[PDB]
Amino acid sequence: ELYPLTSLRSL
Amino acid sequence: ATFISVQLKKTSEVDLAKPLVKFIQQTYPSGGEEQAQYCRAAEELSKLRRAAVGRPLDKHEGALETLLRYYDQICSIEPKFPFSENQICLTFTWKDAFDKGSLFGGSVKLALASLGYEKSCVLFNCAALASQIAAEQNLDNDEGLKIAAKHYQFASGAFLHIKETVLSALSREPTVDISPDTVGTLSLIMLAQAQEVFFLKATRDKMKDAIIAKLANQAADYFGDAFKQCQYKDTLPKEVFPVLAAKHCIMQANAEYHQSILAKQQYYFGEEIARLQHAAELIKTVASRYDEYVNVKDFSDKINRALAAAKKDNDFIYHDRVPDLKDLDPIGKATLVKSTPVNVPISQKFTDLFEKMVPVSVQQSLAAYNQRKADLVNRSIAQMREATTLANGVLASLNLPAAIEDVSGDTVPQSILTKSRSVIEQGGIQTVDQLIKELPELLQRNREILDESLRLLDEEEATDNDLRAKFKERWQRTPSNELYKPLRAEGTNFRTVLDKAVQADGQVKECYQSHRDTIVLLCKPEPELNAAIPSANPAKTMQGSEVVNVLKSLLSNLDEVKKEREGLENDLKSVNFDMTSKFLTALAQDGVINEEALSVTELDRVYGGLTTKVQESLKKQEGLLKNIQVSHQEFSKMKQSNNEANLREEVLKNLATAYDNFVELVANLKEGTKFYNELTEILVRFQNKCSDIVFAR
């Protein structure tokens, strides 16, 4: 994972 | 004339509306319709509880239906808002009905955080009110009988559903009034009194003495069992006990008086007298010990009249012997009565205000389906990219497909030329340079917002602290500090997201400047680029060698494989199955939803076609790569190594490595861009959550 789209989409 | 009834339980009023509204909104799109009718109804639910429970006052099927309306709504709501997931602080408070506990007080309360308690009390109140409407009926009249018989049976049944419900629902020790034993005795009292009524109907309609005796006997059985249940547990109001005793006796005496007319009809004169004598006794005793609670005169006069006449007729005429009671055959029993099952809706004209709201049993199932879909789809994407990355890298490290399109060492191998024109079309180096340039600016734009926001909170807090300092009295509200910690914790979170993004920017910058110069080469016009590639003499027997055509067809097929991964990833992404209905079904037909196994099978019908191919892609790659490196290593043993074509060699491999990097960088760059753009979205909302909370406070 490069940019944290995980952290991003959950918020 | 006096029937037992039960008094309602008292509750304190609570705010239903607003602890529900908190969930309602935190679950749906704020400001939309799927929330419009859900706040309008929750307030109308709070209203309804008020009219149902807020005053022990009204006393007819006006106020009963309201209570039944309320029970039905309170039951319809449990499979929504997570009650069974204790976090809602809706705490319901009821008082004992009887002023009873298992200690010598004068009242006791119990407040509990459970809808199960709430519903047990409402039903008890439905039953009690019904008992009161029944005890008021004019029993000389047919609507009177009909309504008493229906309400008592209703009450009996409501009390019994409580007996079978309380312990599993309420997770505590209940007040005495709603305990299984109490509510089991109340149920039987109501059943008894329902028989009493059917006996009174049969009497009024002048039915056969055979029938009437048996109905009365049955009532007597019912009151007896209730009396017994009362004998070693004093948990009901003090008047219940004597009244059950008298009604038991009166019922026995009624049974005997009817059975005695039947015997007279069959010319058993001794029997008639024996049964009359037993009735006189029961009534004599009742009159003297339970006067307070009964009037038994007419009955007693009628018994005595029958007895004197029967004894006259016997003593003079018939001369029949009077048996002892023990030798008399049992009078039979006939019940005409049942506990009414409780099955919502128990109210007339019922409509579920929140019918539209989706069961929590589905939300959790629907959200947890996603996290298995995601895990399956991303997983598969990642495998495929990880594979294409690895193949392209291996190909580069062996100068393929360049080496075999390399007729002399004179021109630009077709593949390199294709990749070049491909780079130039996508904008060339300017498109990577412009995205590098704007990246620090999207970073900075997001920092600005996070900071402008938290500074709002800081400024407002500085002055709130000063107002508390200088106007102690005049200024007292919970300090800003406490109100703000929720937002501030989102704050330090966002900060962490930013720190990871910067590090990510770090990787892209270092890669970008580590690969710039070669990319710039690749983007030059065809001859300019040809001039910059070193020339070589070809190893000329590369005419139509078998190792060449083998490699060629193998590359055509490795190509095939990787161009197919693009359309796989797109079908993996462009489809989905709405699962709500499948859950809705499994809930209606079966008991609960088990999504675990229900999703695994649907994820297989939906994605199996593609997950199969994704695996068949990897193994086909592994296959193709194993016997490409062995086919290469042999190819190289045919084309010698000197300085002039080693030079051509590296430039070529490095131009292919350059193509991969340009393509990868564009993709990392656009991902950074999209991320920083979605993040601005999230942060603008946060900026507004901050200003709204400073404008209210």
From Swiss-Prot, chain A:
It comes from the Viruses. A motif (LYPX(n)L motif) lies at residues 2-11. Plays a role in budding of the assembled particle by interacting with the host class E VPS proteins TSG101 and PDCD6IP/AIP1. Interacts with Vpr; this interaction allows Vpr incorporation into the virion. Interacts with host TSG101. p6-gag interacts with host PDCD6IP/AIP1. This is p6-gag. The lineage of its organism: Viruses, Riboviria, Pararnavirae, Artverviricota, Revtraviricetes.
UniProtKB/Swiss-Prot annotation, chain B:
GO terms for biological process: actomyosin contractile ring assembly; apoptotic process; bicellular tight junction assembly; extracellular exosome biogenesis; macroautophagy; maintenance of epithelial cell apical/basal polarity; midbody abscission; mitotic cytokinesis. Residues 417-697 are annotated as: Interaction with SDCBP. The modification N6-acetyllysine is found at residue 214. The modification Phosphothreonine is found at residue 478. Changing residue 497 to D: Reduces interaction with HIV-1 p6 and EIAV p9; abolishes rescue of PTAP-type L domain-deficient HIV-1 p6. May be phosphorylated on tyrosine residues by activated PDGFRB. Changing residue 317 to A: Greatly diminishes rescue of PTAP-type L domain--deficient HIV-1 p6. Keywords: Acetylation, Apoptosis, Cell cycle, Cell division, Cell junction, Cytoplasm, Cytoskeleton, Host-virus interaction, Intellectual disability, Methylation, Phosphoprotein, Primary microcephaly, Protein transport, Secreted, Tight junction, Transport. The modification Phosphoserine is found at residue 480. Residues 2-391 form the BRO1 domain. The modification N-acetylalanine is found at residue 1. GO terms for cellular component: actomyosin; bicellular tight junction; centrosome; cytosol; endoplasmic reticulum exit site; endosome; extracellular exosome; extracellular vesicle. GO terms for molecular function: calcium-dependent protein binding; protein homodimerization activity; proteinase activated receptor binding. This is Programmed cell death 6-interacting protein. It comes from Homo sapiens. The lineage of its organism: Eukaryota, Metazoa, Chordata, Craniata, Vertebrata. The chain holds residues 2 to 698 of 868 of the full protein.
